[PDB]
Amino acid sequence: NFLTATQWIGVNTQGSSLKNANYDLRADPIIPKADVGPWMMSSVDPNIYQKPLF
Amino acid sequence: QAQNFLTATQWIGVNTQGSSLKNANYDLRADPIIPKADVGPWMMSSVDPNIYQKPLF
Amino acid sequence: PEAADFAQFAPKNLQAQNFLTATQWIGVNTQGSSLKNANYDLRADPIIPKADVGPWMM
Amino acid sequence: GNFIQNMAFPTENPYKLSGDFGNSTLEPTVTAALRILHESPAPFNTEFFSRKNVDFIQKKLISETKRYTSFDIGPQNEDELIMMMAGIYVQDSTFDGNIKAGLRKLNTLVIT
Amino acid sequence: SDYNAPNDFMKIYYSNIVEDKKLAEKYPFFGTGPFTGLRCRKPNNVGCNTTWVSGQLVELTPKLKEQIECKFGIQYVK
Amino acid sequence: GGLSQLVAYGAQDVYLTGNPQITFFKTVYRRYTNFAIESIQQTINGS
Amino acid sequence: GGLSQLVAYGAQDVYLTGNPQITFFKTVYRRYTNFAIESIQQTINGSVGFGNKVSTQISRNGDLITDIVVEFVLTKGGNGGTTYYPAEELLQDVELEIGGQRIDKHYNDWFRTYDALFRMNDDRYNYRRMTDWVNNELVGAQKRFYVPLIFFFNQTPGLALPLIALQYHEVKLYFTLASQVQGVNYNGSSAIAGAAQPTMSVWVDYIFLDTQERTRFAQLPHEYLIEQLQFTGSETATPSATTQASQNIRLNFNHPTKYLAWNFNNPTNYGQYTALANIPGACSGAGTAAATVTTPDYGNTGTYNEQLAVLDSAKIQLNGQDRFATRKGSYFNKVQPYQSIGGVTPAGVYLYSFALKPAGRQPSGTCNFSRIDNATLSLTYKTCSIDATSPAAVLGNTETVTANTATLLTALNIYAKNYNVLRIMSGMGGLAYA
Amino acid sequence: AGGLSQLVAYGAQDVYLTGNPQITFFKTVYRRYTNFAIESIQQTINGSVGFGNKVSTQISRNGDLITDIVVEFVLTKGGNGGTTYYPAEELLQDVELEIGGQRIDKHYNDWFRTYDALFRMNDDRYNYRRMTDWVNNELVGAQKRFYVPLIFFFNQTPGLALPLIALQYHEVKLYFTLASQVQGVNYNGSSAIAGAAQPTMSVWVDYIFLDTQERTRFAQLPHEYLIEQLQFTGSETATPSATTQASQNIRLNFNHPTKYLAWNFNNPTNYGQYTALANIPGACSGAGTAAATVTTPDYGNTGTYNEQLAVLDSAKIQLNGQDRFATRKGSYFNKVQPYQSIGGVTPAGVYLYSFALKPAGRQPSGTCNFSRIDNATLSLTYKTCSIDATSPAAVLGNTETVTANTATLLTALNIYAKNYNVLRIMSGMGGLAYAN
Amino acid sequence: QSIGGVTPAGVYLYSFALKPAGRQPSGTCNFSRIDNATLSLTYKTCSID
């Protein structure tokens, strides 16, 4: 009877912040969060919970 | 018979400064040679190591 | 039955020609529906298992 | 004695996009068929429009023409074959989950 | 600060910023079914049923799993 | 939006976009021989 | 000198010249087939005159055909300033058939619309010289005009029609001549007494092939990727001083469309896509006491002044959903051409491309309207409140308004340009997509 | 006989053209392309739009790739016809392109004017003017929507479409600065125009929607795009004296493989003024009559092709102390360089020197790598400003080495360099490769 | 369609749910995953005396 605990999402987690999201109705393939180069790296969380309907 | 061998850019001169004078050290002490290691794949610079031919010390 | 085998015909190498004309199958539907191909839903539209059964199911 | 007259005929048409289907890595020919069908990738579709099935059909068209007529023909252009396959596929594609039986019928219709 | 000290050049970065490497190697792929976000082994939902704790992805082991089940009953069906 | 055009793809488009050979959204420029151009004055003989 | 640049080589140059693949300093020409071009006159069946329909069958004199020019000899029925592309106006329409099948059909208005969007600079001026009087000629002046056809085979050798491969099929053109041509046999609605009838001749430029090229054409099947023009005319919603009219027009088009093109016009005056006004060139006698805003300065019928155009905005809706955000008429008139063609489109003529390069031969994106069944062109018109006879109002007005005389633009011509395929085999041919 | 008489006229000289033929002209083969669609989508502009304000937008991820960008502006004339000159171009003072916080490029209103002066042409140029100005003798209060296309590398060709999709973790922004004043719109020379309207602005981006395999390739593969950047600095002009010929050595603080340099001399007072004012019909306010003044241009006719009103006598580019080429006259940079390399008509006061074989194109065709030149400089010689600008006899009947006394108003020098760099995208992030 | 009551003029509703008046979730619009959510309104002309 606990809504905040499942095997897919996780335990004690919330949805990540939204910044520069994919406005398209397509899948927008979530590239793995790779840190390439020690400079100007970005801190955005990918939309792992964007369902690929199309 | 033989003809003249047209030389390369070696007759127009040898560029010695290159791009070493763009960020040259103004101190009399020679700056330590920092190697051109991996500093990411998309924000690199291209000048020169700027090593002193005579360290003056 | 028409055109009696002409073994004396020399150009028997008709490889340089494309005889298939797919002009009659451009824009067809399942059987005979008319909805201008109905590409409305922007999705994959999965395969529906249409089994050739009689007028009833079982 | 007719060899030369026959040999004289070219076997390579300077066709738009000669070697039209396959011979490219940008995207599969199966996908092109799925896109005109507007169907999901599925075993029925990926077997029917597969390179091995397209090849099967092309070989049958060549072989059967040679069996039925005195003529030697080439493979047919594949935009024409894909469009025809998809057309036939749209108007039938009837099976109960038995992909093999379904395919047998659909290939029959395309070849025919 | 101190001169005679270790140079913390990205030590903090490899220690707890970059990727929790042991998980990343054990579980090199990502779930594609509604397990999305979860690192896992093998295809789409095959070597999956790994987990997410309070902050980041962590291996689901029969320590964490059991503690969670005791407080938050979860079936965890692979 | 534009997605309604992507889906507007039929048998009559197979020759145009099925099994694509090229794209128009990524170009590769050729690597070319290094050269330089200089405008040089010539000497005119005669008045 | 230049050598100081060559030696200036480093890492940033590798992407441009390292392991070089090409040069610019050595041209390799390709060896090509042996062919010749001959200009041969065709005979027009029936009789030539205003309002008549005539036709011609292209003879089998060469192997392939391309360029076609329809000559017309006209005499001015009035002075300079009274005509506007009269040879273009005269050739009311042209049908193209192969094997008795319609391949395409052009309209005088299409030629005008086509020019408006796709011709430019000097080629466009020269075109005007081939269809009109541009040197202030006077009444009775006689000129031979050359109206080029713009069917796909009339634009490039690459799409020449292989008459040689059409042993069992004929190729024919049909020309409808206008009942009236401005400044030639009519002045507005009034006939010009004594006006001469046109002399017409159709010229076809034939390609003669040498032995191997000829033989291959005769025995191999031929497929061309060609263009077609789709067209339907309709009434415009009529704007007025009291309202911004709006209209939803079903886009009764099919096949993979490169682009749509359209214009609003006053069917009374050929080529008039804008409102009349008392500003120089915008009406008969504009700028003086005798000016009238019921009749155009025919010799200056066209204009780039969007203030006299009637489209406020437009969008294309497909299957109920917007294809792109609504944009102003000036987007379709000025920007679309900038972005995709590079020419300059006159006010009242609009373009929307579904293609990256709509002016070229190479496919670059299409909208397949046979797969879209609820396609609609949605238009918003400008308010017709500006007093056309008063330059202060004509020239000092706002984005959403136009001339009161803009309500005369009661007709709309919507065109679409699409691809199709011309297939020729065994001496016969026709089109792959209906 | 007839066309056949040409075909049969075959000999040795023809072998080189048609022997063993390789190609034909009578059969075109096209390349098969991918499935894609394009859409014009409005962006949200943050900040307050108005004269002198700086506003910006993050390009939304409404497609996979982006190409064309057009900025719309709505302005009303603050005076009658002839008072404005490409005012929407003047208005958009500058545009900055940033990816992932790194500046990729930046253009200025003057660049748009310079670029146009050198690279647009014929009806393209005219149609361009129609989108940025009032060219149909419009009157005060007239309202028009202007469309200012951007000219960044991705706004020129699909080939360099910016793979917005491959930048899943890095934002792409456009920063726009609007001019404090726009001639003939809110100011007439130095005088503000009471009641002038503030601009309405909208930014449109054309987004490309790719089908699945192509989309996936862009989303997953690393990419390297060879793209262009604009380098620009302003310099003080060694303004010529009315008594002699000034000269100047300008350090060129440029880097990277440069396609070309471009420059102009101007009077900052009047946007687009690259030449001297004079009492001849095409060179000043009221020119040709009693009311003429040579202190103010006929703004609608600000530009001219008459080099008599320009100030450059001659110039050379020196690299690391050595002359790159022999000194050539200003008219050589104004007329010949662009004749040879572009093919259009460059207005007086605007100069070009190419280091490239085809600088108007996109394919690299020879560049000067300024990153390997320790000290590049531009050396200029100016014309003597001795001609009485108010006297057509003097203005039009003068010599090669002189110009108008009003040419001394052209006190600013703008030097541009267009170069190549590489935009490298990987793992959802991307910044231009070379730092300098 | 969704409530079964009568709403007075000037008050508007748009449901993303089948039964918004109940307690059981019946479809929702997650605005935490919608970077841009815009309500577009067009007003009537105020011309009536």
Side-chain angles (χ1 to χ4, degrees), chain A residues 2-13 15-18 20-21 23 25-27 29 32-34 36-39 42 44 46-47 49 52-53, chain B residues 1-2 5-8 11 13-16 18-21 23-24 26 28-30 32 35 37 40-42 45-47 49-50 52 55-57, chain C residues 1 3-11 14-17 19-23 25 27-28 30-34 38 40 42-46 48-49 51 53-56, chain D residues 1-4 6 8-11 13-17 19 21-26 28-34 36-38 40-46 48-50 53-59 61-76 81-82 84-91 93-95 97-99 101-103 105-112, chain E residues 1 3 5-7 9 12-18 23-24 27-41 43 46-48 50-53 55 57-58 60-62 64 68-70 72-73 75-77, chain F, chain G, chain H residues 1-63 65-436, chain I residues 1-32 34-49:
Chain A
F2 277 97
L3 319 174
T4 80
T6 162
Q7 72 161 356
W8 28 80
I9 304 338
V11 186
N12 202 0
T13 101
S16 88
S17 58
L18 201 65
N20 201 344
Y23 282 18
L25 295 165
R26 277 190 252 149
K33 178 66 143 72
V36 185
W39 314 316
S42 74
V44 307
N47 259 282
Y49 301 87
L53 319 173
Chain B
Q1 302 309 113
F5 308 101
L6 300 105
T7 40
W11 70 260
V14 177
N15 204 25
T16 49
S19 44
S20 42
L21 309 189
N23 211 21
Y26 276 0
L28 321 164
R29 314 188 299 182
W42 73 64
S45 162
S46 84
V47 280
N50 187 27
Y52 279 172
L56 169 148
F57 276 162
Chain C
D5 265 306
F6 32 71
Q8 279 85 6
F9 211 91
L14 311 163
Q15 302 152 18
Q17 295 85 0
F19 306 103
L20 305 187
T21 73
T23 178
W25 306 95
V28 284
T30 44
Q31 277 182 309
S33 317
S34 282
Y40 267 125
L42 302 174
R43 269 189 271 184
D45 190 14
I48 301 108
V53 307
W56 38 71
Chain D
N2 288 330
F3 173 77
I4 295 299
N6 191 35
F9 178 79
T11 61
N13 189 282
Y15 176 77
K16 179 176 83 272
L17 300 166
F21 290 85
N23 301 321
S24 180
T25 60
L26 271 291
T29 64
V30 173
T31 299
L34 290 170
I36 64 173
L37 295 176
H38 182 62
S40 69
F44 188 69
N45 289 284
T46 62
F48 178 67
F49 297 101
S50 66
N53 194 61
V54 172
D55 183 58
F56 169 75
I57 293 167
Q58 289 280 28
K59 287 186 168 74
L61 295 176
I62 294 167
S63 180
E64 293 300 352
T65 299
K66 186 173 180 179
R67 183 178 63 90
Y68 290 140
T69 74
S70 65
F71 288 82
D72 182 13
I73 64 168
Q76 299 295 292
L81 184 58
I82 292 167
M84 191 173 292
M85 288 172 71
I88 291 168
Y89 177 94
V90 170
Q91 292 184 344
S93 64
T94 297
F95 65 102
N98 186 334
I99 275 48
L103 179 58
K105 185 175 186 181
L106 270 292
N107 284 346
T108 297
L109 292 170
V110 174
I111 293 166
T112 299
Chain E
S1 186
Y3 173 71
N7 184 12
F9 180 75
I12 190 65
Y13 176 86
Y14 290 111
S15 180
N16 62 345
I17 297 176
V18 176
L23 182 64
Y27 299 95
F29 296 96
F30 289 85
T32 65
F35 302 100
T36 182
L38 272 25
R39 289 174 179 169
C40 58
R41 292 168 181 170
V46 178
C48 307
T50 68
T51 198
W52 222 302
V53 275
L57 274 178
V58 294
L60 182 65
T61 65
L64 178 61
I68 293 167
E69 289 169 351
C70 292
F72 303 94
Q75 294 78 1
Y76 292 115
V77 179
Chain F
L3 295 176
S4 71
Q5 183 178 326
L6 289 175
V7 78
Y9 174 70
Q12 65 272 32
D13 293 304
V14 170
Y15 54 88
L16 297 175
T17 58
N19 197 51
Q21 295 181 341
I22 64 168
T23 186
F24 301 90
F25 296 105
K26 180 69 172 74
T27 187
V28 179
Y29 293 113
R30 295 276 79 82
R31 299 183 301 270
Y32 67 97
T33 57
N34 194 286
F35 65 92
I37 303 169
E38 188 180 0
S39 183
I40 299 173
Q41 190 172 37
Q42 302 298 305
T43 298
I44 299 168
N45 292 304
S47 295
Chain G
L3 293 174
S4 70
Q5 185 178 325
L6 293 177
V7 300
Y9 178 82
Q12 296 186 252
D13 294 300
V14 172
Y15 294 89
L16 277 69
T17 64
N19 297 319
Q21 297 173 307
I22 64 168
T23 187
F24 301 110
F25 297 101
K26 182 68 172 74
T27 296
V28 178
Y29 293 101
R30 273 64 170 173
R31 299 184 301 269
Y32 63 96
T33 60
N34 184 31
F35 67 90
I37 309 300
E38 187 176 1
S39 184
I40 299 171
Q41 189 172 25
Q42 301 297 306
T43 295
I44 300 167
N45 289 306
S47 63
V48 176
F50 288 105
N52 292 325
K53 181 177 178 179
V54 300
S55 67
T56 192
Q57 181 180 346
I58 298 173
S59 63
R60 298 180 190 277
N61 297 156
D63 299 311
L64 314 175
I65 59 171
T66 56
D67 299 353
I68 299 176
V69 179
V70 180
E71 295 183 0
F72 296 97
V73 181
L74 305 175
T75 57
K76 288 180 62 48
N79 290 322
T82 62
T83 60
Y84 189 69
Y85 295 87
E88 192 184 69
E89 184 177 11
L90 176 59
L91 183 54
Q92 181 175 306
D93 67 39
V94 184
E95 295 184 67
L96 173 67
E97 294 182 349
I98 301 173
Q101 297 190 26
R102 184 177 297 106
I103 303 302
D104 203 358
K105 182 173 186 177
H106 297 169
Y107 300 84
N108 57 5
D109 192 73
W110 175 239
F111 281 93
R112 177 64 180 86
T113 299
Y114 174 79
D115 186 70
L117 295 173
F118 296 95
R119 292 201 178 87
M120 61 187 78
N121 305 331
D122 282 353
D123 183 55
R124 187 171 183 184
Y125 181 79
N126 192 62
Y127 173 78
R128 185 175 183 178
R129 293 175 72 206
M130 291 168 63
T131 63
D132 206 351
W133 288 271
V134 297
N135 301 282
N136 300 317
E137 291 87 344
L138 301 172
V139 65
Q142 185 183 52
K143 295 286 179 287
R144 183 177 299 269
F145 294 113
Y146 299 92
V147 179
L149 301 181
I150 57 172
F151 293 109
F152 66 90
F153 68 95
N154 300 135
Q155 295 186 39
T156 180
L159 299 173
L161 303 180
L163 294 176
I164 190 168
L166 294 169
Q167 184 174 39
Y168 304 94
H169 282 181
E170 301 296 331
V171 179
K172 296 178 71 176
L173 283 297
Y174 302 82
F175 305 87
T176 300
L177 305 177
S179 65
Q180 61 180 65
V181 178
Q182 171 65 44
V184 179
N185 66 332
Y186 293 90
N187 188 26
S189 68
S190 296
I192 299 171
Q197 297 299 306
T199 298
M200 183 182 171
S201 179
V202 179
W203 289 86
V204 179
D205 291 348
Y206 288 83
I207 298 159
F208 294 80
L209 301 173
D210 199 335
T211 300
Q212 294 78 8
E213 182 178 2
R214 178 184 169 88
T215 300
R216 287 194 296 271
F217 271 94
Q219 70 193 340
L220 301 180
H222 303 270
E223 179 180 357
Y224 301 90
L225 180 63
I226 64 165
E227 297 180 2
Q228 297 183 297
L229 182 68
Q230 297 177 63
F231 173 74
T232 179
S234 67
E235 298 83 358
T236 59
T238 299
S240 76
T242 62
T243 187
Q244 292 192 255
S246 64
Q247 191 174 9
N248 296 292
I249 302 169
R250 188 173 292 167
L251 290 170
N252 293 319
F253 298 103
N254 290 90
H255 306 296
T257 297
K258 292 173 78 179
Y259 62 87
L260 302 179
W262 64 97
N263 68 59
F264 299 86
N265 66 75
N266 181 343
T268 303
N269 301 310
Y270 177 78
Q272 183 183 339
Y273 302 125
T274 64
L276 302 173
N278 190 17
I279 62 171
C283 70
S284 174
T288 190
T292 177
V293 296
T294 63
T295 301
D297 183 355
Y298 288 106
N300 294 297
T301 298
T303 187
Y304 298 104
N305 187 359
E306 71 184 278
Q307 290 174 314
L308 299 176
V310 296
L311 184 65
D312 182 19
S313 71
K315 65 178 183 178
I316 300 169
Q317 183 177 25
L318 306 175
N319 292 329
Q321 295 178 339
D322 291 351
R323 173 60 183 77
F324 61 93
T326 304
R327 305 295 294 277
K328 295 293 191 179
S330 63
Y331 172 74
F332 301 93
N333 183 247
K334 295 177 180 177
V335 178
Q336 281 274 316
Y338 177 81
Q339 290 178 263
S340 65
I341 299 172
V344 61
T345 299
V349 179
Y350 302 98
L351 170 69
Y352 184 80
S353 177
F354 302 106
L356 297 170
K357 297 180 181 179
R361 296 285 89 79
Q362 169 69 56
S364 58
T366 60
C367 180
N368 190 334
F369 283 94
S370 297
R371 307 289 288 194
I372 279 179
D373 184 1
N374 263 320
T376 300
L377 176 64
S378 295
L379 305 174
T380 301
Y381 294 83
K382 293 185 178 185
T383 301
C384 300
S385 63
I386 299 299
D387 183 348
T389 64
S390 178
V394 174
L395 297 171
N397 64 53
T398 63
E399 182 177 50
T400 59
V401 300
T402 190
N404 64 300
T405 57
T407 64
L408 297 173
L409 301 172
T410 62
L412 164 64
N413 292 335
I414 302 168
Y415 299 94
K417 175 74 75 168
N418 65 281
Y419 285 105
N420 207 314
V421 176
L422 176 63
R423 179 178 178 273
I424 301 171
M425 174 178 274
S426 300
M428 296 185 184
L431 301 181
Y433 311 111
Chain H
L4 295 174
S5 69
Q6 184 180 326
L7 292 176
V8 76
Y10 183 89
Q13 292 179 277
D14 295 303
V15 172
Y16 288 91
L17 275 66
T18 60
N20 194 35
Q22 296 171 300
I23 64 169
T24 187
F25 301 115
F26 305 115
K27 184 69 176 70
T28 296
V29 300
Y30 297 93
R31 301 299 298 276
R32 178 175 297 89
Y33 67 99
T34 62
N35 186 33
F36 68 93
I38 61 173
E39 187 181 352
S40 298
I41 301 175
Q42 189 173 26
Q43 300 298 305
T44 298
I45 296 96
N46 293 311
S48 176
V49 175
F51 289 109
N53 292 323
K54 181 179 178 181
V55 300
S56 68
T57 188
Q58 181 174 344
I59 298 172
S60 65
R61 293 170 64 196
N62 281 110
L65 312 173
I66 59 172
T67 56
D68 294 357
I69 300 174
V70 179
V71 181
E72 294 180 1
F73 298 100
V74 182
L75 302 172
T76 58
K77 287 178 61 50
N80 289 322
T83 62
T84 61
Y85 189 69
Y86 297 87
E89 193 183 67
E90 184 177 11
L91 176 61
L92 183 53
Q93 179 181 288
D94 60 50
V95 184
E96 181 175 354
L97 175 66
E98 180 181 2
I99 300 174
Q102 202 203 354
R103 177 182 298 182
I104 294 169
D105 202 357
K106 185 170 183 177
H107 299 165
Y108 300 87
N109 56 6
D110 193 73
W111 175 238
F112 282 93
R113 177 64 180 86
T114 298
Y115 175 79
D116 187 71
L118 294 172
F119 296 95
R120 294 197 181 87
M121 61 186 75
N122 304 332
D123 289 350
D124 187 66
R125 176 175 286 173
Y126 178 69
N127 193 60
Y128 175 79
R129 181 178 180 179
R130 292 176 71 207
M131 292 189 291
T132 62
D133 206 351
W134 288 268
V135 297
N136 302 283
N137 300 320
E138 292 88 341
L139 302 173
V140 65
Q143 185 183 52
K144 295 289 181 69
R145 184 176 298 269
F146 295 111
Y147 300 89
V148 180
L150 302 183
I151 56 173
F152 293 119
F153 69 90
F154 64 93
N155 300 135
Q156 295 181 337
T157 180
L160 299 174
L162 190 155
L164 187 62
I165 191 169
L167 295 169
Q168 295 91 333
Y169 302 124
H170 254 247
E171 75 281 10
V172 180
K173 293 185 176 180
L174 303 169
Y175 297 87
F176 301 94
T177 302
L178 276 59
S180 64
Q181 61 183 59
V182 178
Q183 170 64 46
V185 178
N186 65 332
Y187 295 90
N188 188 25
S190 68
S191 296
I193 300 171
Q198 297 300 308
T200 298
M201 179 177 177
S202 179
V203 177
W204 293 88
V205 178
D206 289 351
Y207 296 89
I208 301 101
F209 301 89
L210 302 173
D211 205 325
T212 298
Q213 190 65 47
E214 181 179 1
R215 184 174 66 252
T216 301
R217 286 178 175 278
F218 279 98
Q220 298 298 314
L221 299 175
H223 306 279
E224 297 183 354
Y225 290 80
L226 181 62
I227 63 167
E228 300 179 13
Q229 298 180 290
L230 181 69
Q231 297 175 71
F232 170 71
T233 64
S235 297
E236 183 176 357
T237 300
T239 302
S241 171
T243 63
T244 190
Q245 294 189 259
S247 64
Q248 188 175 14
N249 299 296
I250 302 168
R251 188 177 186 190
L252 301 174
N253 294 318
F254 296 133
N255 292 288
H256 306 294
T258 296
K259 292 172 81 180
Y260 61 87
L261 303 182
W263 64 96
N264 67 56
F265 300 89
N266 65 74
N267 181 347
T269 302
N270 302 313
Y271 177 78
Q273 183 183 342
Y274 302 113
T275 62
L277 301 172
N279 190 15
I280 61 171
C284 69
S285 174
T289 190
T293 179
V294 296
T295 62
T296 301
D298 185 10
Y299 289 103
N301 295 295
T302 298
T304 183
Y305 299 107
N306 186 358
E307 71 274 14
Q308 290 174 315
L309 299 175
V311 298
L312 183 64
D313 183 20
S314 71
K316 64 178 182 176
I317 300 167
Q318 187 179 87
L319 303 175
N320 198 33
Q322 299 295 312
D323 292 347
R324 175 59 181 91
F325 61 93
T327 304
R328 303 295 292 275
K329 305 299 292 186
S331 63
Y332 175 92
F333 299 93
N334 184 245
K335 297 177 183 177
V336 176
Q337 282 280 309
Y339 178 77
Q340 291 174 289
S341 65
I342 300 173
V345 179
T346 299
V350 179
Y351 302 98
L352 171 69
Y353 182 79
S354 177
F355 300 107
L357 183 60
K358 298 180 181 180
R362 292 186 295 274
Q363 166 69 60
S365 59
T367 60
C368 178
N369 186 346
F370 278 76
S371 295
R372 304 290 292 174
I373 304 300
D374 184 60
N375 187 27
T377 68
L378 177 65
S379 295
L380 305 174
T381 301
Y382 295 86
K383 293 184 179 185
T384 300
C385 300
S386 63
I387 299 300
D388 184 346
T390 64
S391 178
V395 174
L396 297 172
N398 64 53
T399 63
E400 183 177 48
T401 59
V402 300
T403 190
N405 64 301
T406 57
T408 63
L409 297 173
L410 300 171
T411 62
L413 167 61
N414 291 338
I415 303 166
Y416 299 95
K418 195 81 188 299
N419 64 279
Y420 288 100
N421 205 323
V422 179
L423 177 63
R424 266 147 155 196
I425 305 98
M426 37 194 55
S427 298
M429 292 177 72
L432 355 173
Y434 301 103
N436 55 39
Chain I
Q1 291 177 335
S2 64
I3 299 172
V6 63
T7 300
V11 179
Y12 303 99
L13 169 69
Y14 182 80
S15 177
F16 301 109
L18 296 170
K19 297 182 180 180
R23 299 285 83 77
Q24 168 69 56
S26 58
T28 60
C29 180
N30 185 350
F31 287 111
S32 296
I34 301 169
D35 181 6
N36 180 0
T38 295
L39 178 65
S40 295
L41 304 173
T42 300
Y43 298 88
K44 293 184 178 184
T45 300
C46 300
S47 63
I48 300 300
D49 184 343

